[PDB]
Amino acid sequence: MLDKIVIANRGEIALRILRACKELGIKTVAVHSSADRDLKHVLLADETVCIGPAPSVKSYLNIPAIISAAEITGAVAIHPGYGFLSENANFAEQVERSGFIFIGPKAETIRLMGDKVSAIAAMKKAGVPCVPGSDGPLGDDMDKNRAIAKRIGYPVIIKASGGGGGRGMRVVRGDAELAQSISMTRAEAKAAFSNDMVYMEKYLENPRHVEIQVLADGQGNAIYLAERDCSMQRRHQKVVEEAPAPGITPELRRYIGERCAKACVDIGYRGAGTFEFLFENGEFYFIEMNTRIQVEHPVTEMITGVDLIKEQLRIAAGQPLSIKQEEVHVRGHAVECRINAEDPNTFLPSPGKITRFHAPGGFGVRWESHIYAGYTVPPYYDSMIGKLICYGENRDVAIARMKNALQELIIDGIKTNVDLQIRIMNDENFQHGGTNIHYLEKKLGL
Ligand SMILES: Nc1ncc(C(=O)c2cccc(Br)c2)o1
Ligand SMILES: [Cl-]
What we know:
Binding site for biotin: 338
Domain Biotin carboxylation: 1-445
GO cellular component, one term: cytosol
Shape: globular
CATH architecture of the largest domain: 2-Layer Sandwich
Protein name: Biotin carboxylase
Bound molecules: (2-amino-1,3-oxazol-5-yl)-(3-bromophenyl)methanone, chloride ion
Number of strands: 20
Binding site for Mg(2+) 2: 288, 290
């Protein structure tokens, strides 16, 4: 087992990683900004290193400072969590070059998945179903670009190869808007990623977001741990996630899961990963792969019993996966509601001091958060302050427990989305299940 690790993150996920480390007897190093001295995981960590001032550029994105922290404490590995540097291939490369273990895949694999065009090409080669598309970058020849759109058939969507997560894209419904749509996507990608490469896909009107969780070790084992539906979104940010995805049969699960696991073997994947699919009319279409552990990982843990963070750490130490595919079984159902410190009318972050706090409890209730009474949510970071995860023997029980748990949850002193989450739980289309990626913004606009 890894002797000591740097937790290169903050808030709920840093606490999540800390708990996993403690369970495995791994010593913890909490690197934190000057604004995060009183984070719960920092207070619980074996060692702490302040790596810079509040702004993320000088702290949680500060590569030299994070690596120096690992050096000075005699740590052997770095867990990047999600966000920040978790998908930064240059960071992973530096970590390994500096002699530390990066908890994640090889840097080359991170780089591959950050290149949406080359990632699609690899998955298609591996036998994973992808969206009908350009199968390559679009050039400057508008005759060729029109020809690609015709072959695919309108409507189409232009996407940035350096983008992802709903960022950097526009829908084209005919020839008249094609040139400008390509030009604008190119410009925005250049400004945001210094990478103007763009590609084209068939536009799917009302798909669901269904993603497959994988784990792969260094012994050549690769498994899939069912799927999650993450369709409930505002401005491409997930609000509610659940596992398994409603309407997905064991046959479909097996079909798509086996292809994801096979792809992992082909590409030499290692660690946790997520294959994102658009799912429409009974068909899966690969769009992107995330290499990090994700925000929504706990719903998968609830239905499989697999502790995914502990698996990441076991994998990094050189241990094989603790479970085989034939030992992975979907049981029950889990729902996650993201708790955000946000204004209900503007949806802008609403930081400040929590005055009263009470977490829900009970059978099937899981609370993932660093927050406590008297804790100040800083303005410098993401609005998500907690995750409420409820499990039941079926979806209806999971939702019932979520409703009860949300009513027990007290967070005073700051504005939160608890009331919105309650509304969603009570929404008759959500209760039916299988709402598409556009549902929430439509519901709120009505
Ligand atoms: N082929 C394809 N269709 C839609 C998509 C998307 O990724 C997407 C996601 C969110 C919103 C919108 Br509009 C499109 O990709
Ligand atoms: Cl994430």
